């Protein structure tokens, strides 16, 4: 009935947790909670019962994560594609969501005592107006909490998120807050729904599917990918433990690759900027280098002016995003 189970780890779980916590631990784990309906059929129960147990496992898995010191979790809860299912199933899912978000506001203050921040990411205008208001309440209430973070991807796809982010930047140049040349990989990051969290360390999908189904495609480009056969309502602490173990075995090569990518992107951005400065300096008829350090000044100004327009764009984008949440 609540959104986080209150239970400590058993001996073997505690013991193994202490062991792996001697190595690199994930700061952020993302889940694709897949396999509910197959689980319902395997246990000879209705599909709403499968989905209902699926939510219970989400509350259980968050307690495992908090006990493991993993304080940020993102979950795929409802895809835009899931709107294509039968009205009976979609209404069943909408009703389950109405019920848990309503119990969430009743279980408030218990959200203060643990500092849990609830973020709900997606094209939320596709949801029923009432469910939107329940979502907005929960989001507005748990803002300014910082002890842990749960991002619920509801009525979400990654392509819709990436498209909206580009629309945001296009709004920036339309308003005069951005030049088209300011658009960058780093700037698109900050226009995603997930812009207040770091990219996931691990992406876990259950049920044995080896696809991503339009989930955090931008964000998991360098995440550890763990595809586990177990059905989501049957997820155990040890499935989660196995996934973290996978991440620890991948960590050294994943971190080097993450850093080589970042270093290469900054190197190429510098080459492009120097070439821009050189093109302008080839025009005007000025020297490409010299003791006056003209190109060094124009490089600093080109960058500083870019960071200034970007910071102004982001402040306006955050004011617009708080406005819709306030109403």
């Amino acid at each position: 009935m609540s959104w986080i189970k209150e239970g400590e780890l058993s001996l073997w779980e505690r013991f193994c947790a202490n062991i792996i916590k001697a190595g690199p631990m994930p700061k952020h784990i993302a889940f694709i909670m897949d396999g509910n309906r197959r689980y319902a059929k395997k246990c000879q129960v209705e599909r709403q019962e499968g989905h209902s147990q699926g939510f219970n496992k989400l509350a259980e898995t968050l307690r495992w994560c908090l006990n493991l010191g993993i304080l940020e979790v993102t979950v795929y809860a409802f895809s835009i594609e899931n709107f294509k299912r039968s009205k009976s199933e979609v209404d069943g899912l909408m009703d389950l969501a109405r019920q848990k978000f309503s119990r969430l506001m009743e279980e408030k203050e218990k959200l203060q005592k643990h500092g849990v921040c609830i973020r709900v990411l997606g094209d939320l205008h596709l949801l029923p107006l009432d469910l939107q208001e329940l979502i907005a309440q929960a989001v507005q209430a748990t803002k300014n909490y910082n002890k842990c973070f749960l991002n619920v991807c509801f009525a979400y796809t990654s392509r819709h998120e990436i498209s909206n982010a580009v629309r945001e930047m296009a709004w920036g140049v339309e308003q005069g807050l951005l030049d088209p040349s300011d658009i960058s990989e780093s700037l698109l990051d900050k226009c995603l729904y997930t812009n207040r969290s770091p990219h996931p360390d691990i992406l876990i999908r259950t049920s044995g599917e080896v696809r991503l189904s339009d989930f955090l495609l931008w964000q998991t480009s360098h995440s550890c990918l763990v595809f586990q056969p177990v059905l989501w309502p049957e997820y155990t602490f040890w499935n989660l433990f196995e996934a973290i173990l996978q991440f620890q075995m991948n960590h050294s090569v994943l971190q080097k690759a993450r850093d080589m990518y970042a270093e290469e992107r900054k190197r190429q951005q510098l080459e492009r900027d120097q070439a821009t400065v050189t093109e302008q300096l080839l025009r005007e008829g000025l020297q490409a280098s010299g003791d006056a350090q003209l190109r060094r000044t124009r490089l600093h100004k080109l960058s500083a002016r870019r960071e200034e327009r970007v910071q102004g764009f982001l402040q306006a984008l955050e004011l617009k995003r708080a406005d819709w949440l306030a109403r």
Binding site: V166, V253, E264
Partner: protein, 202 residues
Amino acid sequence: LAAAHHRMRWRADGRSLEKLPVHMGLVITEVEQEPSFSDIASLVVWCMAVGISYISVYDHQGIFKRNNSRLMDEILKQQQELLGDKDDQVLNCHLAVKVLSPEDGKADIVRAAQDFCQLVAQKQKRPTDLDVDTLASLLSSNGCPDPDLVLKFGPVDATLGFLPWHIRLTEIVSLPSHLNISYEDFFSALRQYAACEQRLGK
């Protein structure tokens, strides 16, 4: 005539599967040694022989993009030996084979965002005119289909910046190494993709 029999056998193999990829991705994550170009070329030639239209070769260090001629030469060499007029063979491999590196992913989405924001600044487009499909058309993929199967070679459990936008439904099959890869191993991955069930959210 011996090569004609092999051509038939390979085409019969691809036609026998419940489904075949139209666009195959090869992601090489092994960084111990430099990749085996003859092994990569063999995977590519098998893809063409069994009927896969497009093949994208990817590594996150850009080694294949910086050794494009070596790779094509090896592909053309083995394709000729299997298919027993070099220009048409060269043009065919250039139309089917694309060598990719990280910049083809996120950096290309950024390039498209710049192109669209430039149209907004010219009063030729509105920010609201950029839906999921228009952005898809703006990418460097153009008309080519998204990869439906990716063979990931190596010990890294990651896609490492491979067509983020295009792999929303791509099946990701993992093999331990591309070195001395066998056709049986390659075809077993095709059988796995053939057996997968795609529900599209329904």
